[PDB]
Amino acid sequence: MPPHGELQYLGQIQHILRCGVRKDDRTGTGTLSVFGMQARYSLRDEFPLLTTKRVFWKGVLEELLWFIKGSTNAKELSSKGVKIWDANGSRDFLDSLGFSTREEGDLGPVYGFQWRHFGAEYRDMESDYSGQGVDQLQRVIDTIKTNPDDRRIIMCAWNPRDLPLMALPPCHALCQFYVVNSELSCQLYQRSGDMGLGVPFNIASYALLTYMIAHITGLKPGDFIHTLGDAHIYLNHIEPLKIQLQREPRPFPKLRILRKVEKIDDFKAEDFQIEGYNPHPTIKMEMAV
Amino acid sequence: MPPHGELQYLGQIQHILRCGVRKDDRTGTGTLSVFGMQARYSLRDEFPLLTTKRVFWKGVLEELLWFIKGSTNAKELSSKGVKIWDANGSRDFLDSLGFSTREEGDLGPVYGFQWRHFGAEYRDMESDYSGQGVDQLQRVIDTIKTNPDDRRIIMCAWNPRDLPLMALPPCHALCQFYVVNSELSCQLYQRSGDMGLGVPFNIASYALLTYMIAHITGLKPGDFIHTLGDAHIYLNHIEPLKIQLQREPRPFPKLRILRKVEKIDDFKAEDFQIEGYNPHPT
Ligand SMILES: Cc1cc(O)nc2sc(C(=O)c3ccccc3)c(N)c12
Ligand SMILES: O=c1ccn([C@H]2C[C@H](O)[C@@H](COP(=O)(O)O)O2)c(=O)[nH]1
Ligand SMILES: O=c1ccn([C@H]2C[C@H](O)[C@@H](COP(=O)(O)O)O2)c(=O)[nH]1
C-alpha cells in the first residue's frame, strides 16, 4: 500500500534534527533550523490530523471559523476555550510592542482582517468594515465555481502596509488553490513554522479550510501541499520530539460534514464530525513567547 | 394630554419616590420600592431610548444578539466590549454558588439557553444543543407568521427546574407578543427592576426585540408594555434620580434597519442605525 501520510512530517522533523543548524533568536531559546521544505498530504479520504501526538482539534476548528468571520479579537476566540492567541493579545505583550492604547485581545489586522477586508484602513478590532477592502475569500470561492482552471486563485495574508499594526505578522503569507478533474487542491506557503508546536496545528487548519471550500463548490478534496521557509525546532523541543519520533503513526481520521452548507459564512462548529481519531497522548511543548 | 412617553418612566420614578416603602435586599443597600407597576411605550416611528440619562445602546444591541445566538458565555459578550454580565461570570462570584467545577464566564442556563433550548439538559456553555429543547424564539416567529390571533405567544425564561444552575435568576420571566392590525406589540414581565440603571436598559432591549421580530414578520411595531414586580430605587440613587427627574425629556430617536433580513439569526449589529439620539449627560 502507499506509505502513511504522517511520515511526511516525521521525516521533516528528522531532517532538521540531523541536518539542522543552530540559530539564536528573540525568545532566548535557540533553534535548529532549515530553510525550504515541502510536503504533500492527500485529503482523500483521510484527513491529515496528526496521530503521533494529539492535536488541538477543538482549537483548530474554532479558530478557522473565527477567521471566516473576519475576527481579529483574541478574546472572542479565547472565550470559546481556545487560548492559542492570548499570549499575543495580552495587555503585557501588546504594551511591549508600543500598543499602549489598544484593547486587550486586539491582534491587529491579521488573518481575519486580510482574508475579507484586505486594503481596508484598520481602526480597531470592533469597528465596522463591511464593504471595505477586498474579500479574498469569496473572490476565491466564486472563482473555483466559475473558472476552475484559474492559476491565480490566491489568498494573501501578507500586507506590508498593515505590518506595524499586527501583534504578530502572518505565518501564512499566502495560500493558493487548484482544481483539476473537479478535485480541489491547496498549497500553503508558510514563512516560519514551529515544527514542534505549531506545524501540526497548521496542517489541520488548511486541510480543514480545503474541505470547507470543496463542500461549498461541489468539489472533492485532493492534496494539501505544505511549503515552508524557516522550518525550525526550538532547542527545548528536541527531547519531546525525539520521544514522538519513536511512535508509529496510526491511520488518519476521516472528516464528516454533517449538513449541506450553502455559503462559507454559515458554517458552524457542530457541522463537522471527526471519525476514528486514535492519537497517541499529547506532549507538552513550551510556546516560546 | 397624558404621557407620552419617556414621561411614563419618570412618572414611575416619581411614584416610587412619593409612594415608595423602604425595604432591604440582598446587597444590604436598601431601597424605596413599589410592587406592581406598568407603563406603555409606543414604538410607532419612534424608538423608546430614554433621553434624560444616557442608555448604553451598544450593550442593548450586542446583548440582544447574544441572547438570540443562544449564548450564556459571559466572556463571549465581554469580548464584544460590553461587560455587563462580567460581574457574575467571575470565579470569585461563580463558586460563591458552589460552581467550583465550572469554567469562568459560564453563567449557566440563563436567558439565551431558555429562549432557544428550553427544557434541554444544560451541561456547559461551549456545548452542542442542536435540536435539543424547545426553541421558544423561533416558535414565536412561526406563530405570528401563521396565527396572528393566537394568545399563547409566550417566550418564558423562568425555568424553575434550572434555577439551581443559573448564575442569576432571570429578571425577565416572560414576554408575550400580540398582533393586531398588522402591528406587533410586546409585553414584558420583569420580576425585579431598578429604575436607576437596569430598567431603562431593559426597555431598550425589548423594544429592540419587537423591532427585529416585526421586521422578520412584515409587521409594523406597536406598543411595548413594561410590567414590573418589585420596582425599586436604590437609596444612593435617590439624589441623582431627583436631578435627572427635572430634566426636560427630548424626543425619542428613530431606529432604522439597513437591510432586509430573512431569519432572526442573520441580524448583525451593523444592520442597525440609530438616528437623532440626543440624551443629556449623567
Ligand atoms: C513560538 C510562538 C511565539 C509567539 O510569539 N507566538 C506564537 S503562536 C504559535 C502557534 O503555534 C499557534 C498556531 C496556530 C494558532 C495560534 C498559535 C507559536 N508557536 C508562537
Ligand atoms: O500559526 C502560526 C503562528 C506562529 N508560528 C510560529 C513560528 C515561530 O516559532 C513563531 C513566529 O515567530 P516569528 O516568525 O515572528 O519569528 O511562531 C507557527 O508556527 N504557526
Ligand atoms: O436584566 C436585568 C437583570 C437584573 N436586574 C436587577 C434588579 C435587581 O436589582 C437585581 C436582581 O436581584 P434579584 O432579583 O435576584 O434580587 O438586578 C435588572 O433590573 N435587569
Author numbering:
A (entry chain A): 25 to 313
B (entry chain D): 25 to 306
Task: Quote the original article.
TS is a pivotal enzyme in production of thymidine monophosphate and a well validated cancer target. Inhibition of TS leads to thymineless death characterized by DNA-damage, chromosomal fragmentation and concomitant induction of apoptosis. Novel classes of TS inhibitors with improved efficacy and resistance profiles could provide important complements to current TS directed drugs, for which there are reports of resistance. Here, we show for the first time that a CETSA-based screen for direct physical target engagement constitutes an attractive high throughput screening (HTS) strategy, which allows for the detection of known and novel TS inhibitors with cellular activity.
We investigated one of these, CBK115334 or 3-amino-2-benzoyl-4-methylthieno(2,3-b)pyridin-6-ol, which was chemically distinct from known TS inhibitors. Confirmatory data were obtained using CETSA on K562 cell lysates, which demonstrated a 3.7 °C shift at 200 μM. When applied to isolated recombinant human TS, 1 showed a 2.6 °C shift at 25 μM and a 5.2 °C shift at 100 μM and confirmed binding in the low μM range using surface plasmon resonance. The binding involves π–π stacking interactions with the substrate dUMP and polar interactions with residues lining the catalytic cavity (Asn112 and Arg50 in particular). This constitutes a novel mode of binding as compared with other anti-folates occupying this space. Amongst the new hits was 1, a μM inhibitor of the purified enzyme with sufficient cell penetration to result in intracellular target engagement and anti-proliferative effects in the high μM range. The binding mode of 1 to TS is partly new and it thus provides a potential starting point for further chemistry optimization.
